[PDB]
Amino acid sequence: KTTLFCASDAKAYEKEVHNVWATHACVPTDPNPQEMVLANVTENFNMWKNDMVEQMHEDIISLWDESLKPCVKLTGGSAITQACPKVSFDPIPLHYCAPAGFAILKCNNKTFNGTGPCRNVSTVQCTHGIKPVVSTQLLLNGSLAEEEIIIRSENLTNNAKTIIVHLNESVNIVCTRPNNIRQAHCNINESKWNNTLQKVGEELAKHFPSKTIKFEPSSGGDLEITTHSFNCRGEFFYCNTSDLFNGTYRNGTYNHTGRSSNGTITLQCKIKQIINMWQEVGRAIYAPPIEGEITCNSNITGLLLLRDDTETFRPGGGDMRDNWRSELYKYKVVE
């Protein structure tokens, strides 16, 4: 309803680029913030139609433009060339804050699906700290659901609408290009992956009850969405998830169909130079990888899925606003 501002805990002596941008663009965080509970109120939220998502999307676009300059950017017919130095890149949390005379309602119902009415509501200056993690298929380094796994969708009946699965237990994923320069791999403990898909299948079954629930790799499209893609310490990883989204939940029980070894799933990854941009329809070209080991140790805290008797779910992604939605669902700007 108005224009927000950001508060961060950055330091202008980091030259990690999130820190630098935040020094330029955000104010320091209130050491101890104010919160106003109101369990009588009951307000309506709609995470799918939330202007904070647009504001934050704009901010992260600006952050990436200032911080991860491509050597070349192709947009339409145009090509733009600029210095593309390697940088230190580790996302920091950002808080979004209502300016004087507005507030941010937080919905405190732990099971709120992001849509409709919510009874226990709070007033706050700012959201919690949100790390702006750009990725597809898996949501990384978010904040887990407090009680049960939550299923969010603008419209579960419309299979074209992305499904956000909010996990209550995070699942470690470790990706590494060890010390072919482009080749890398991720490791997930097949045990926790097994459990979490069991319970995701349970919740999906509540929403589609007669059907058997299958998980399958992404059908088609750009590499950025047919693989789990993400930025790790500057470099763009594309990791194959076909041994990950590969299972069946039949009669209250989940069977994993992907292949594992010694009880870990290992995704083959490539580090790529030519990127399909998430900010706009366009391509972006970066320098070859730094040397040394490139490792990210991340928590999977959510999934992005798309639905095609049986119901079949595939990893989705590509519109980074959904990532922001997954974190901003509980908040509204008011007055």
Ligand X SMILES: CCCOC(=O)N1c2cc(CNC)ccc2[C@H](NC(=O)C(=O)Nc2ccc(Cl)c(F)c2)[C@H]1CNC(=N)N
Ligand Y SMILES: *[C@@H]1O[C@H](CO)[C@@H](O)[C@H](O)[C@H]1NC(C)=O
Rule CB under 6 A: which residues touch ligand X? 134-136, 162, 222, 224-225, 229-231, 236, 275-278, 280-282, 318-319
Considering the rule CB under 6 A, would residue 113 count as an interface residue with ligand Y? Answer: yes
Binders of ligand Y among residues 46 to 65 (CB under 6 A) are none
User: Which residue minimizes CB distance to ligand Y?
Assistant: 116
Break the chain down into helix, strand, coil percent, rounded to 5: 15, 40, 45
Asked if 314 and 306 touch (Cβ cutoff 8 Å), the reply is yes
User: Which residue minimizes CB distance to ligand X?
Assistant: 318
Comparing C-alpha atoms, which of 326, 327, 328, 36 is closest to residue 162? Answer: 326
Binders of ligand Y among residues 1 to 40 (CB under 6 A) are none
Select from ligand Y, ligand X, none the partner in contact with residue 278, using the beta carbon and a kind-dependent cut-off of 5 to 8 Å.
ligand X
What is the distance between the alpha carbons of residues 303 and 169, in angstroms, rounded to a whole number?
A: 12
Q: At what angle are helices 51-67 and 320-328 packed, to 10 degrees?
A: 130
Least distance from ligand X to the Cβ atom of residue 52, Å: 17
Query: DSSP string of 167-214?
Result: EEEEEEEEEEE---TTEEEEEEEHHHHHHHHHHHHHHHHHHS-SSEEE
Comparing C-alpha atoms, which of 206, 200, 199, 244 is closest to residue 226? Answer: 244
Least distance from ligand X to the Cβ atom of residue 156, Å: 16
How remote is the C-alpha of 120 from its chain's centroid?
26
Binders of ligand Y among residues 81 to 100 (CB under 6 A) are 91
Comparing C-alpha atoms, which of 329, 235, 302, 323 is closest to residue 57? Answer: 323
> Which residue has 């030519």 as its token pair?
274
| Shorter beta-carbon distance to ligand Y: residue 3 or 255 | 255
| Shorter beta-carbon distance to ligand X: residue 129 or 282 | 282
Least distance from ligand X to the Cβ atom of residue 59, Å: 15
| Shorter beta-carbon distance to ligand Y: residue 23 or 113 | 113
Positions touching ligand Y (CB under 6 A) are 91, 113, 115-116, 133, 140-141, 148-149, 151-153, 155-158, 168-169, 190-191, 194, 199, 202-203, 216-217, 223, 226-227, 230, 232, 240, 242-243, 246, 254-260, 263, 296-298
